[PDB]
């Protein structure tokens, strides 16, 4: 029995930033979701468009796993229709959604005494992201008429800003690891099935 490698998406040494997240395609395997919703580690398990139970009774053609690390107060923005900085400029979900969002606290791993500034996010952008669109451009923002020509000055800001994670921060400011599973269905032999 060839089981899907869910143990290399949830069980990882290094995660990706919000602005450049990691997407993994899962196909041609059997998916034992019983390990996930029966685990007490996860603090947020919200499934949109399906039921968490009876999930392993349908067969899909592909599953996409998008993983990143955000703050505590930004987990509520990973939902269809929500607005903010993470939803508008970093990771956007379509209004119609067939998938699940899983999130758990990672203070013991992603927080270090003195700060863990290895995670970035985009704070400024001209327009909102389209659903499932990734932007990794690093160009100076511009809120004034006069172009500053690639040097940070007055009204010209660098758009990527770092995250400060420390072990003593509040729950709302502590790092959280988020995995978003999207089940897509097209015309195909429906490779991904359940047990």
């Amino acid at each position: 029995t060839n089981l899907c490698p869910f143990g290399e998406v949830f069980n990882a040494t290094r995660f990706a930033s919000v602005y450049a997240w990691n997407r993994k395609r899962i196909s041609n395997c059997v998916a034992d979701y019983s390990v996930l919703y029966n685990s007490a580690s996860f603090s947020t398990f919200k499934c949109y468009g399906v039921s968490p139970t009876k999930l392993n009774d349908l067969c899909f053609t592909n599953v996409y796993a998008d993983s990143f690390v955000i703050r505590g107060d930004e987990v509520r923005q990973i939902a269809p229709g929500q607005t903010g900085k993470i939803a508008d400029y970093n990771y956007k979900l379509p209004d119609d959604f067939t998938g699940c969002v899983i999130a758990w606290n990672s203070n013991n791993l992603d927080s270090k005494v003195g700060g863990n500034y290895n995670y970035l996010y985009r704070l400024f952008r001209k327009s909102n992201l389209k659903p499932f669109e990734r932007d990794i451009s690093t160009e100076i923002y511009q809120a004034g008429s006069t172009p500053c020509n690639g040097v940070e000055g007055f009204n010209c800001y660098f758009p990527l800003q770092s995250y400060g994670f420390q072990p003593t921060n509040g729950v709302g400011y502590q790092p959280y690891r988020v995995v978003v599973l999207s089940f897509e269905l097209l015309h195909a032999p429906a490779t991904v099935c359940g047990p």
Binding site: G115, L123, A143, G144, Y157, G164, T168, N169
Partner: protein
């Protein structure tokens, strides 16, 4: 293209992100020094504070490029107006250096004050040798020599510096379009452009004087009673109708009359309520004290203490050799981090201070959702008035009787209640005229009304007229008596202590009316009343995002200061004070002095 309002929003979005991290690092650096007094930590704290100050200075100049007349949003205008203020940087560099060195010289002379006892074997400082003489003594000569000695040593050197400090600070106030330094200090109560909820810098004087006018009749009765009780201790040195000498007021400056309680207790045969003995009969530890303090706030609807509060906070004195600073404080480190530092003990007083500190913590957790630049109290007097109403409720017999610290068959006598109201009146009512007089004198000195050569001819004239206190020995212009106080020497405003007292009793009266409590106000308890916590949280939530007049209206129902609740609280004591003073003269004649005869 964008309007100024849409560029000053991007600037603030960047500013919040940088400033939160820098300020949190500074607060952590200070915390590691207060809880561990060493030598390396001092240097680390200095570096962190210097970095934060430099960043704030650069952002202050950065914020001025965006005008304020072109901004419509009220919250954006408040946030930008908070950051636009510069301060002492508007002066010339040499003048700024002179101001800094003058203030540092004043702090050094005040902290290193030395007085010489007539007995050559003894040399005493203010902390704690002189204070132990002032608070705990019952002779006239020792207090006289101590009171004159401290002033004679420090005022002579502090007097020449004060004139230069006044002229330089007035120049700085002229730099920022303020009339004088007093107006710059009164600008903390100003609301502009709000509408009906507006307040002018010149209105504060009118409100303070109007509020003191109503308070004076009660203070006169209390003053007469204290004078009659002071007859029995110093029969040959106090007139039956004269002002009380300044060195018999219970401490160094007469700010609080609490230390006069043993002399002036109404019924000395009745012991005050002290639950320390029964607190040690159940083996109460410190964590239990803070757990009951937490339960008090839980019962009224306010949230619970965070998990990191229990681990990070220093709730007891360490025993591994670490030296700490034992002044009770509540720290809002930022990034959702709240702590309390306290060398607590198993005593009733620490049991009350736990509720006070947790009230500060609750205010900090309440306004945490506002923008970074609006995370403060409505003004300087709001933050310290919220805490006191918690200690008012935590000390009522109804609170301890339901807490198990008092038997259900406990009977309280009216004598004990009168004793409690007398001790409350010595601390609260007895300090208002001193604060109002001192701040009025400083305001008129800064305004230029008082000439430099008439500084001690008016200072005492007001003291007799407003406070009813006469000097024991005549002083010339070579003395600087106001500079002998800690807050005057270190350039701290003093009017916040006057307004905090009014706000605390307005808050107490409103919250007791919400709970539908019946009876005298001093017996009120707001425990288990979930309806009063909603009204409190209506004011706590705003922070500094709405005008202080509207923040006051949200909890009380009026947008002005009022001393009627304060007089309501002390009404049972006044009805007993009038009967005692029926056969004694009230009011003080200014002519009689101890030195004249």
């Amino acid at each position: 293209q964008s309007t100024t309002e849409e560029q000053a929003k991007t600037f603030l979005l960047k500013f919040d992100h940088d400033a939160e991290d820098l300020s949190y690092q500074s607060s952590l650096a200070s915390w590691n020094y207060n809880t561990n007094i060493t030598d390396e930590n001092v240097q680390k704290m200095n570096e962190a504070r210097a970095k934060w100050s430099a960043f704030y200075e650069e952002q202050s100049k950065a914020a001025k490029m965006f005008s304020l007349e072109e901004i419509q949003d009220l919250t954006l205008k408040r946030q930008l107006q908070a950051l636009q203020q510069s301060g002492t940087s508007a002066l010339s560099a040499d003048k700024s250096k002179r101001l800094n060195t003058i203030l540092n010289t004043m702090s050094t002379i005040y902290s290193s004050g030395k007085v010489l006892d007539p007995n050559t074997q003894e040399c005493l400082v203010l902390e704690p040798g002189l204070d132990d003489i002032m608070e705990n003594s019952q002779d006239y000569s020792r207090r006289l020599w101590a009171w004159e000695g401290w002033r004679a040593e420090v005022g002579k050197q502090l007097r020449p510096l004060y004139e230069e400090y006044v002229v330089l600070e007035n120049e700085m106030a002229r730099a920022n379009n303020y009339e004088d330094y007093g107006d710059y200090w009164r600008g903390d109560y100003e609301v502009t452009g709000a509408g009906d909820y507006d307040y002018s810098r010149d209105q504060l004087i009118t409100d303070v004087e109007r509020t003191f006018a109503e308070i004076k009749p009660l203070y006169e009765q209390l003053h007469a009673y204290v004078r009659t009780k002071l007859m029995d201790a110093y029969p040959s040195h106090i007139s039956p109708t004269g002002c009380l000498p300044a060195h018999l007021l219970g401490d160094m400056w007469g700010r609080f009359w609490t230390n006069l309680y043993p002399l002036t207790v109404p019924f000395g045969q009745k012991p005050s309520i002290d639950v320390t003995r029964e607190m040690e009969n159940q083996s109460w530890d410190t964590k239990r004290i803070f757990k009951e303090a937490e339960k008090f706030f839980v019962s009224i609807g306010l949230p619970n203490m965070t998990q990191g509060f229990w681990d990070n906070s220093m709730l007891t004195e360490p025993g591994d050799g670490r030296k700490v600073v034992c002044h009770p404080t509540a720290w809002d480190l930022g990034k959702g981090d709240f702590r309390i530092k306290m060398c607590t003990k198993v005593t009733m007083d620490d049991f009350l201070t736990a509720h006070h500190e947790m009230g500060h913590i609750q205010y900090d957790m309440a306004y945490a959702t506002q923008p970074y630049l609006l995370r403060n109290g409505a003004n300087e007097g709001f933050h310290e008035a919220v805490g006191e109403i918690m200690s008012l409720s935590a000390a009522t017999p109804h609170y301890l009787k339901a807490l198990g610290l008092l038997p259900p068959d406990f009977y309280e006598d009216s004598e004990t209640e009168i004793n409690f109201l007398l001790k409350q009146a010595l601390t609260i009512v007895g300090t208002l005229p001193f604060t109002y007089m001192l701040e009025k004198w400083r305001w008129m000195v800064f305004k230029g009304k008082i000439p430099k050569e008439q500084w001690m001819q008016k200072w005492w004239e007001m003291k007799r007229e407003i406070v009813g206190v006469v000097e024991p020995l005549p002083h010339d212009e070579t003395y600087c008596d106001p500079a002998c106080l800690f807050h005057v020497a270190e350039d701290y405003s003093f009017i916040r202590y006057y307004t905090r007292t009014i706000y605390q009793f307005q808050f107490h009266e409103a919250l007791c009316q919400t709970a539908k409590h019946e009876g005298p106000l001093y017996k009120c308890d707001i425990s288990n009343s979930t309806d009063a916590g909603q009204r409190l949280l209506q004011m706590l939530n705003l922070g500094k995002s709405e005008p202080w007049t509207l923040a006051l209206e949200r909890i009380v129902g009026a947008k002005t200061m009022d001393v009627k609740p304060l007089l309501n609280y002390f009404e049972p004591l006044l009805t007993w004070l009038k009967d005692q003073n029926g056969n004694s003269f009230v009011g003080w004649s200014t002519d009689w002095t101890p030195y004249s005869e």
